[PDB]
Structure formats: C-alpha cells, structure tokens
Amino acid sequence: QIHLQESGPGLVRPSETLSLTCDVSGGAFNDAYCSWIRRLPGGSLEWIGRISGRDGYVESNPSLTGRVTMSIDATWKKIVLRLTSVTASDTATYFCAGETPEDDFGYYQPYFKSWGQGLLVTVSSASTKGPSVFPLAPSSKSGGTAALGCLVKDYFPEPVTVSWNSGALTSGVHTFPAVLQSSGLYSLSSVVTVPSSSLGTQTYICNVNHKPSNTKVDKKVEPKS
Amino acid sequence: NVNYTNNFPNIGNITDEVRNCSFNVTTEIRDKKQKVYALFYKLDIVQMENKNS
Amino acid sequence: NVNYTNNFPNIGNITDEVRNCSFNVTTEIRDKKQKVYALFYKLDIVQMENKNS
Amino acid sequence: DIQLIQSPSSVSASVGDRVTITCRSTQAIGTDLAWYQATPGTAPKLLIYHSFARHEGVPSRFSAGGSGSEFSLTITGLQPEDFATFFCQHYKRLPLTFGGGTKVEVKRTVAAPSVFIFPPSDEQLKSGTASVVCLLNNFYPREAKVQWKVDNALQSGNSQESVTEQDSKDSTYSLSSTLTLSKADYEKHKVYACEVTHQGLSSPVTKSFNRGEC
Ligand SMILES: *[C@@H]1O[C@H](CO)[C@@H](O)[C@H](O)[C@H]1NC(C)=O
C-alpha cells in the first residue's frame, strides 16, 4: 500500500543543512512522483519541490531553488531530503505525498491522495532544557469567582506532557496551545477554567509531566487582597 | 438512458459496436498528459500490437 | 544614444512600444534548437495565460 | 505563482448547514484545482479532484463544482468529522499553492465567561517576571479583544494570547490574559486594568488590578 511515514532528525538547529528522511508502506513509486509539504503552525501551508520518481530530475520551490536536494535510487521506498540553510519559517509540520500515476481525467495531475504521518519539525535556536511553574493566586478566595492557574515558561523539546491532579481531572480542565517565543524557546501558561460556584474548596494542582523531571508542584487558591 | 427507447424494430443498439477512445495531449508540466475523449466507430480503428491501443 | 537626438516633435520614443522577445525555435535541422532573440512591436503580440510570457 | 485567497476566511455552522466556500484565484486556471480536508491532528485527504469530480469513498454531500477563476464547495450533510479547515489546491501551473485557510466551526454551546484579577504569588515576585491575569472561561466566539493599559500604552509579546481550539465536551473557548512582564516595568506601573468586551457576554465588565499587597 502507498502509505507514508517520516521523522528525519526531528527538532533541529538553525543555519544547518537538515536531512528529513521519509518512508513508504511498500507502494513503490515506480512511475509516480513524490513530494514534500510544509504546513506552517496553524492557517496556511506551503509546497516544497516535488521529485520525479521515474527519473533523476528534481523540481524545487522557486524561492528555495537550490536549497532542496534528495537521494533517489533503485528502491522506491527510500526518499530522504537534504534541505539546506534552515530558516526561522521552517518550523512546521512536514509531509510526504505520492503523485497520481494514472486516472480517467488525466495522468500526472498533482491531486495528492496518499499522505504521511506528519511531524512538527521546528527551527528552535537553542535547547535551553525545560520549564518552570508559576502560580496564579487570586486576589480573593467585576465577578465573584477566583480562578487559579499555572505558567510553564521555556519548555523543550516540543512537546512536553502536562496533566492535572495526577490525571484525576475533576471538571472541565484544559491546556493552552503551544506558542513559541522570539528567542526560539517554547512557553505556556497552564491555567484551568474555574466555575463561578465552587470557591475556596476546589484544588487544581498542575501536573507538568516532563520526561526526565516529571514534577507535580502544588498550586492552590488563596486570597491576595 | 430510457430502457424501452420506444423500440419498434428491436433490432439492437450501438453498444459493443463503437469504441469510446481517448488519446494523450501535451501539457506544460514535465511528463503530464490529459485525455481528450471522443467516440469513434469500430470501422475506423484497428489494433496492431500493444494490446489496448 | 546621444542626448538631443534632434527631437523635432517631442512625442516620445520606441520604449513601451517594442519588446525584447527571446524564444527558442528549431534550425533547419529537425533536432537542433537555439535561443533566438528578436524585437517585436507590442501591436503584433498578444498576452496569454501565465502572464509573464 | 497562482495564489488562492479562498474567501471567506472563517465561518460557523451547525450539522447539515448550507455554508459554501468560494476559492478566489489570482488568474484563471481552467478546471485544474483540487480539494483537501484537514481534520485536526491528521493529514489532508482529497475531497474534490479536477474541481468537480467527487472523490471515491466520500459521499455526494460535497456539492462542488465551478470553472474559471471561481470554485465553490457547498456542504449539505455537515458532520462532526467534517468540522475542519479546507484548502483548495491549484495544479495548472508551477509552483503549486494551497488555500488561504478556511476554518469551519460549530454554531452551538453559547456560554458566557467570568473574568477576574489575579496578583502574582511568591514565585513570580522572586523570579524576574510576574503576571497579571484576566482569565476568560467558557466564552464564544474568538473575538476576545483584551485591552491593557501600561502607563497609557499597550504592549504585545508578554500579552500571551492564544485562544484554545473548540472543545467537544463543552464546545466553547477558554483564554487567559497572562502578562509575563519583568518587574522593571511590571512592578513599576502600580495599577493595572484589563478592558474586555464580548458579544457572548450580555454585560461585559472591566477588571482593574492592584499592585500586590495593595
Ligand atoms: C529552448 O531554449 C530554452 C532556453 O534554455 C529552454 O528553456 C527550452 O527548454 C528550449 N526548448 C526546447 C528544448 O524545446
């Protein structure tokens, strides 16, 4: 079957020539073409230059004409790229896709059907280890509700697991989406939705379940009036 | 179509007497071709080799 | 060109009226193609899709 | 070389609505345009190839068609799975460009939020940066226009604003007003105030912050 999977090197460092490998589920591209797809975080996405599976020809993004190179050989299941000069806009979810070999309307029309797993490959400029937790103690125990929370700044690598109350979530807990920073590190402010009825008794301990650290720093509601 | 087709003579139908044919036409993209379909009678097409051509 | 050019009418010049077109066509040999560049006036040329050629 | 506006940018609809998305192309591309369904967390799947040929497997609810520079994909039987963005892809000329982004949203679960002020705890004050939060809980839609005054000014970046995506248990939105500002100017401005209004809020309120012990 023509099913695709790619991981390459994962999260990388800027100003370096990365190599994002990709694989096939046995559907050899003997006549079809393979291609890359870059999907920016949210919103739109951009197409990276496709490859000619049958021949040795390489097509590229006009703005990135010389930046992309791939390795092709007799086996059709091994497609690995050699993207050069990774930039700040390369932090996106890459993809693999297979060109239509034949159809009743046309033959090589790019209406990609087979698609890969897809992973978020970033361009974070530094490792910078892991996050820290910041409480959100309310003024009271305009509004009558007092909502606590947490702030987990500079977490790496993307992603890092977070839960609540050792997994024993009580009611309507949630987490904010991942947002990057200008320096390259990833920060988040894990604040939970709080009802305007049960106050002074509810507890929302923040479970930052980082892979090496895995700490469960306490966080409760207290007056700050 | 209408199956009855008001068949007074009931002689038959064109089916299995014409060969609905298509051929490639060039395009700007490298190695990409379309189909320009047409209908031709069997008396104006022959096959030499390369079955289904 | 020279500066004055003896501009009797002062009406303009061939710029924005002639185009430098550099296409590629065959020679007398059926298997030899060369980039032939020629000048054609804008009244002899129409613009088609992919609006850069 | 052929950008695709794909207007409108956003739309909210319920199950089995009659919302349509029209793809705006910079030049005529004939009928060479494809479609994709970007279900959250998954790769896009082709929906309408050749701009009118319905893909195999998927039903005929996708009332698509059109030729020239305009293409509309109207959905009849809207489904919970179909609530995802759509990207129409042209393939007539190189390079290939995708759609501009058309996120589709549920119409339901109109819930109102509750906003409050929250002073920094010990960990923020001892650390370099603290935060003043005007947390928004269970609101709708994504038009939370939080206003912040800091010495007669508003600053971005530290205003870590990222509204959560639509939920399935509550199908509403949660957003916080975290202001990660260092005490050099955070603690400098004694009094803060967040000005928020929301159409889901019948009576939007403005919350003002008092410096720490104050
Ligand atoms: C004609 O020459 C141009 C210039 O390199 C080239 O791009 C084009 O492919 C040529 N046309 C042919 C070989 O038919």
Coordinates of C-alpha atoms in Angstrom, one line a residue, chain D residues 81-197:
Chain D
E81 CA -15.8 15.0 11.5
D82 CA -16.2 17.5 8.6
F83 CA -15.7 20.4 11.0
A84 CA -12.2 21.2 9.8
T85 CA -10.4 23.7 7.6
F86 CA -10.5 23.4 3.8
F87 CA -7.6 24.2 1.3
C88 CA -8.3 24.2 -2.4
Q89 CA -5.1 23.4 -4.3
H90 CA -4.4 24.5 -7.9
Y91 CA -2.1 22.4 -10.1
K92 CA -2.4 24.0 -13.6
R93 CA 0.9 25.9 -13.3
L94 CA 4.1 25.7 -11.2
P95 CA 4.7 26.4 -8.4
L96 CA 1.7 24.9 -6.6
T97 CA 0.0 27.0 -4.0
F98 CA -2.7 25.8 -1.5
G99 CA -5.6 27.6 0.0
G100 CA -5.5 30.7 2.3
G101 CA -7.3 28.9 5.2
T102 CA -11.0 28.4 5.7
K103 CA -11.6 27.1 9.3
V104 CA -15.2 25.8 9.8
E105 CA -16.7 25.9 13.3
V106 CA -19.7 24.6 15.2
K107 CA -22.5 27.1 15.9
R108 CA -23.6 25.8 19.4
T109 CA -22.9 26.0 23.1
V110 CA -23.2 29.7 23.6
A111 CA -21.6 30.1 27.1
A112 CA -20.6 33.3 29.0
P113 CA -17.3 33.8 30.7
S114 CA -16.2 35.2 34.1
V115 CA -13.2 37.5 34.4
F116 CA -11.2 38.4 37.5
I117 CA -7.8 39.9 38.6
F118 CA -5.1 37.6 39.9
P119 CA -1.9 39.0 41.6
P120 CA 1.4 37.2 41.4
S121 CA 2.3 34.7 44.1
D122 CA 5.7 34.4 45.8
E123 CA 7.3 32.5 42.9
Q124 CA 6.6 35.4 40.4
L125 CA 7.9 38.2 42.6
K126 CA 11.1 36.4 43.5
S127 CA 11.5 35.5 39.8
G128 CA 12.3 38.1 37.2
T129 CA 8.8 38.3 35.6
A130 CA 5.4 38.3 37.2
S131 CA 1.9 38.1 35.5
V132 CA -1.4 39.9 35.8
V133 CA -4.2 37.6 34.5
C134 CA -7.7 38.4 33.4
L135 CA -8.8 34.8 32.7
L136 CA -11.7 34.2 30.4
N137 CA -13.6 31.0 30.9
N138 CA -16.1 29.3 28.5
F139 CA -16.7 32.1 26.0
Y140 CA -17.7 32.3 22.3
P141 CA -16.6 33.3 19.7
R142 CA -12.9 34.0 19.2
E143 CA -13.1 37.8 19.3
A144 CA -11.7 38.4 22.8
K145 CA -10.4 41.9 22.5
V146 CA -8.5 42.3 25.7
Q147 CA -7.3 45.9 26.3
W148 CA -4.4 46.6 28.6
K149 CA -3.1 50.0 29.8
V150 CA 0.5 50.3 31.0
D151 CA 1.5 54.0 31.5
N152 CA -1.0 54.9 28.8
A153 CA 0.2 52.2 26.5
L154 CA -0.4 48.7 25.3
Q155 CA 2.4 46.1 24.8
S156 CA 2.4 42.8 22.9
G157 CA 4.5 39.7 23.3
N158 CA 4.2 39.5 27.0
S159 CA 0.4 39.5 26.3
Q160 CA 0.5 35.7 25.8
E161 CA -2.8 35.5 24.0
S162 CA -3.6 32.2 22.3
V163 CA -7.3 31.1 22.4
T164 CA -7.9 27.4 22.8
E165 CA -9.4 25.5 19.9
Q166 CA -13.1 24.4 20.0
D167 CA -13.7 21.7 22.6
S168 CA -16.0 18.6 22.3
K169 CA -17.3 18.2 25.8
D170 CA -18.1 22.0 26.2
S171 CA -17.6 23.2 22.6
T172 CA -16.6 26.7 23.8
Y173 CA -13.4 28.8 24.2
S174 CA -11.0 29.3 27.1
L175 CA -8.5 32.2 27.1
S176 CA -6.2 33.8 29.7
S177 CA -4.7 37.3 29.9
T178 CA -1.3 36.3 31.1
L179 CA 1.1 39.3 31.1
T180 CA 4.7 37.9 31.6
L181 CA 6.4 41.2 32.4
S182 CA 9.5 41.8 34.4
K183 CA 9.4 44.0 37.5
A184 CA 11.5 46.7 35.8
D185 CA 8.2 47.8 34.2
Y186 CA 5.7 45.3 35.6
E187 CA 6.2 46.4 39.2
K188 CA 6.8 49.9 38.1
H189 CA 3.2 50.5 37.0
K190 CA 1.3 50.5 40.3
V191 CA -2.3 50.0 39.0
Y192 CA -3.3 47.8 36.0
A193 CA -6.7 47.4 34.3
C194 CA -7.9 45.0 31.7
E195 CA -10.7 46.2 29.4
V196 CA -12.6 43.3 27.8
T197 CA -15.9 43.1 25.9

